[model samples]
Target: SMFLPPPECPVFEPSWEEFADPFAFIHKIRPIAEQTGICKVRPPPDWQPPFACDVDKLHFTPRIQRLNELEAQTRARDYTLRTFGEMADAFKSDYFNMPVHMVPTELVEKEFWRLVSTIEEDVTVEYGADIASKEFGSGFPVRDGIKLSPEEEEYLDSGWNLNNMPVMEQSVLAHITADICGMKLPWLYVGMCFSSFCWHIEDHWSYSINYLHWGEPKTWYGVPGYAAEQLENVMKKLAPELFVDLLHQLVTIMNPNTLMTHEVPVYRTNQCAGEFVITFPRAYHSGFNQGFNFAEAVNFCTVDWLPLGRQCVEHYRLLHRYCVFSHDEMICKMASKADVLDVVVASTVQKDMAIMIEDEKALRETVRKLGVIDSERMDFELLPDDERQCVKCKTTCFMSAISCSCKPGLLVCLHHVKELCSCPPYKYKLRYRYTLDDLYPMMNALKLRAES
Candidate 1:
C-alpha cells in the first residue's frame, strides 16, 4: 500500500538494428538517463523471453519484512489516505529521516543494528531468490540465425543473454569459469507481496541488469553514481552494525527526491514482467515485490567499467575492505594473456591499462621526489596477499606500492603518500613491481596481442 515509483524515470525503446551491439548501444545512450538513476529498456517489437522455470520445484531460502506502526505513507493508489480494511500504519514515517540533520554517524550505526535486532519480531513482506536458476545454458550462443520459440529466441537475442556480455564472458569469475556465488549464472528470483532487496550497490560497484519474467510488478528506488559517496557516508556512519549477517535481510522504502534536494540524482520505476532494468556503476538501489512475481538478475561489466573497477577498489580501501578480486592483478592477467583476448575487450582493457600505467608513472616520479627512489623495487605480486597489502587502504599492493625502511613489511598506495608513516617524506621509499619503462611495453604487448 506504500509503494510509489519516481514520476520522471525514462523507458528506452531501441530498434533491432540499434540494439545489436549492446555495449555500444548502452554506452552511446546511457547518459540520457544520467539525470535519473536507472532506466527500463523495451526491446523491439515481438521480442519476448519464454518463461520456463517451475516455481513449485525451485528450491531457495525465502525472507520476509514488515512495518513498526508504518512511519510515512506515500499516498499509494491515492495520497487521499483511504482506510485499509484493517488499520495499517505502514509507510507513515520519512524513511530517510528526511529532515536529515547532522549528527555523529556512530550513533546511526548503533541505532541501525539496535533497531534491526528487534526487526524479526514484526513481519509484513516476504522475499526469496529471483525465479529460474535452471541452467538453460547460453540463452543465445553465437548464432548464424537459429530458430526457437519467440520466447527462447527472445531470451537468446536479449543483450543480457549470457552469449552477449563479453565482460562477463571474458572474466575469470564469470560463467564457464564461474557459478552463482561468483555471479556467473543468471539467478532467478521469486518474490511474494512485500518481498524486497535492501539498499546496496553491486559487488565491486559493477553494473547489474534485472529482468522480470512475469507476474506482479516490482518497485525500485535508486541513487545515482555521484551520490554513491553520500550514501556511502551514511552506510559507513551506520556500519558499526552493518557487518552483521542479519542486516542483509533489511528493507526500507524512502522517497528518492529526498536525495535530489542535496543534488543527488534519484529515480524509481515499477518494473513489470517482460521489462529489463539496468543499474550503472555505484548506483545504490533497493526494491520490493509488488505481489507475487518472478525475476532473473545477473551482474556484469563493460569496457567502460574497467576504470571504475580500478576506482572501486580504491573506494573499497577507504572502508579498509576485502575485494572479490585484485584490480591490478586482473589487469596484469589480461596483459599476460592478451593474445587470447577478444579484440574489442583487449582494446578497452588497453585503454584502462594505459590510464593505470600513467598513474603509476606519476607515482614513481612522486616517490623519487620524496628522495626514496633508491629504495628497493619490490615485485609485489610475487608476494602473497598477506604480504602485499597497504598499511593504510588495505588494497592489494599490485605493481607500485610505497614503503619505508622505517616500517618493515608495511606498505600503502601512492595516493596515501603521506599516510604510510609519520616519518618525513624523505624517509619513505617507493616499492614498485615494474620500472616505468617496463610498464609501457606491457601495454604494447597487450596492443600486439589485440592486433594479432
Candidate 2:
C-alpha cells in the first residue's frame, strides 16, 4: 500500500446532545459525506473507552515477515514485544530495511500506509484477525459478562463500544430469527506500520465500524456503496490480465491511480488513534497501518440496512456469488413475529415487506398470464430453505418462487422474472407462501403494531 496525498474523509465530532440517538447521528452525517463512504467519529473528549488492555499481558503470536513482500505469511507465530513503539520501529527498520528518511512527508506517509493494491509497493509484514471478545474478552461490556475490574464496567452503556452495539442493533428485525454468527460481535486487530489490509466487504452487506484503540494512525481508502459495483467494473476493466498474470483477484491489485484515471469517485483518510471510522453498507474500503496500532471492529445490521441488503443480494445474483444468509427468511421471520417486534423496526420492515409482497404478486400474475400454473403453497416458510431458495439469488423463497417442471428443485425469485427456466415461462409454477389475501393481514398486523 502507498499514500501520496489522500483526500481527507469526513470527520464528525458530535456533542453529548447530538449523540442521543446512534441511528440519528449516523443518518444525519450520512448526507454530509454520503458518497465518501466513511466518516471519522471524534466523540467528546470525555467519551473514550474505559481503559486500554495491557499489551504484554495479552499474548499473541506474530508471524515473521520479509521487507518488500506483498503477500502476508501465517507461518509459525513468534513472540514480539507487545509495546506499540517496539513493534512499529522493529517492523520499520528490521523487516522492511527502510528507514524513515528525508523525503516529502506526503510520499513517506503514502509509502508507509497505502494498500499495495493502490501503488503496488511492498515493504511490510502484517499479522492479526485475533478474536478479541472470545479470547481476550473485551474492555467493552457485554451482556452478563463478568467484569475484569470496576474501571471497565463504566463503558458498559457507552453507545460507541462494539460490545454495546448488539443492544441497539438487535432491533425488531435481527432478533426475530437471525442465526447471527457472521454477526460475530467484535474483532481486535493489531497492526505494524506498512502492514496492509485488502479491499473487500462485510457478509450480507452489513455496516462496519472500527476504532483505533491506540498507537499510530491507519490510512483508509473508500468507495461509496453506490459506487461499489462501479469500482468493481473498473477493476476488471483496468486489468483483466492482471488477474492471471499476478495470480490474484482484482482486489489484490486494485490501484487508486487506476480508479482516479477512470474518474471513479473514491475517498481517503488517515485515522489516528482514538478516532472511530464508520463504513456504510457495501462500501468498498482498504487500508494499511501507518505504524504500530491496536483497533477493534465489528459488523452489524439494523433496519436501515435491510433495504440495501435486498439490493445487495440482487447485485450478488448477477455475479453468481454465495450469500451469507437468506434475506427472505429473515423478513418472513420478522413478519411472523409482527405482534412483538420493536415499534420502529416493525415500521421499517413492514415497508420493505409491502414491497416484497407487491413484487411477488406482480410476478405471479406475469407467469400466470404466460401460461404457468398458480399454486398457493401456504406452508412455503415451513419448507426447507434449500427447496425454495432462488437458484439465481439465494434469497429464501418464503413468499413466492418461480419454478418449472423442466428444472426440479430450482427456483428464481420474482425479480429474476425472465430466469424462470429453460422450459419457457409457460412451463413454470408460481409457488407462493401466502395468498394475496393472507399477505394483507400480515401487513395490517405490522401497521397496527408499529402504530401501537
TM-score of each: 0.68, 0.80
In each prediction, how many residue pairs overlap at the backbone (N, C-alpha, C within less than 3 A)? Answer: 21, 7
**Native RMSD of candidate 1 (Å):** 10.3
Model 1: per-residue Cα lDDT over 1-452, one tens digit each = 12223564788888888767667767876787545557788777676655553323444444435533213221112111122201122321123343223322233332333333454546454345432334222223334444455556546545557444534434433312212354445655656544556677777787777778776677777777778778655544344344321122333333344445555566777787778888888888876664456677777777677888888987778777666556777777777777777777778779888988887778777767766645666766567676777777777777777777888888888777878878877777767677777778878887887787
* Residue 427 displacement (Å), model 1: 12
Give all candidates' CA lDDT scores: 0.61, 0.67
Encode model 2's per-residue lDDT on 282-365: one tens digit a residue.
888877776677788877777778898888777766665555566766777777788878888889989988887887777777
> What lDDT does candidate 2 reach at residue 130?
57
